[PDB]
Amino acid sequence: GEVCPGMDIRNNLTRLHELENCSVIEGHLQILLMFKTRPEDFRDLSFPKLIMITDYLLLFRVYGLESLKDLFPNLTVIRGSRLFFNYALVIFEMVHLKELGLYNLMNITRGSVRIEKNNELCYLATIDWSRILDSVEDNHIVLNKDDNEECGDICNCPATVINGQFVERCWTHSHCQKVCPTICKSHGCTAEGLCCHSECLGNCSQPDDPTKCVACRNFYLDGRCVETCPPPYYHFQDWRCVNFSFCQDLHHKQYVIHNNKCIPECPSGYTMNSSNLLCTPCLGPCPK
């Protein structure tokens, strides 16, 4: 598909169509403050091309939005390279949300989840987040319809044990939460339970093939999931390999090269030698 940059969508739905061809959002996705929107505005709205967000997903005050199952049906990975106060997923004051419905969400690399103050929000207790986040310790899921004993959650689905009891796991009435065998780890699997290639992230279109991932556990280059960017390529945005020229083009109106990475700024003890974008250490104290 396409790589789009981090987006900030407010007030009107008009700007939302900027995501239409998008596959990876390199940066964050914030959709917020839509006070005049109604359910009808979302009945026909879908971005099935979105597979991954490199930073974080934030939904706040978006009126008329009842589920995300149609909006982001194929979002599989949120990498959490940059987070919104320790969170890679924020669902806050989503007056009208009845369920999450992100049935393709397999992994949150990095972050934690904050789902707070959602009157109407159910299908939360049906989610085993331990399959999605390494650390659920820091999850802050409070003040939702779910807290007040009367969610009519209904799921065939695989059950998992979180407290002392086994509970069936699903996203909506019609979508189970996919659970891959223990041995697949984070790589994902096919319907038949066959593990995806070890360089894949949440799922694959074919098993045992690093060119057929729908994610990349490590880095992406020329179709394939690779463990590392080989030289002459540089690690970029913690998910893709680029050449020096790309990093240079960006810099020229402030990306720099350091430790085989194309980075926003030089780290501590270093300053930027102008002709080659390379971070070089400071002779005496650092000018800044």
């Binding site: 917020l32 403050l33 706040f60 919104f84 106060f85 806050f92 802050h140």
Partner: peptide, 11 residues
């Protein structure tokens, strides 16, 4: 945090 949220989501 609602603090962070406003201090961040507000111009």
């Amino acid at each position: 945090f609602e603090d962070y949220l406003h201090n961040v989501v507000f111009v």
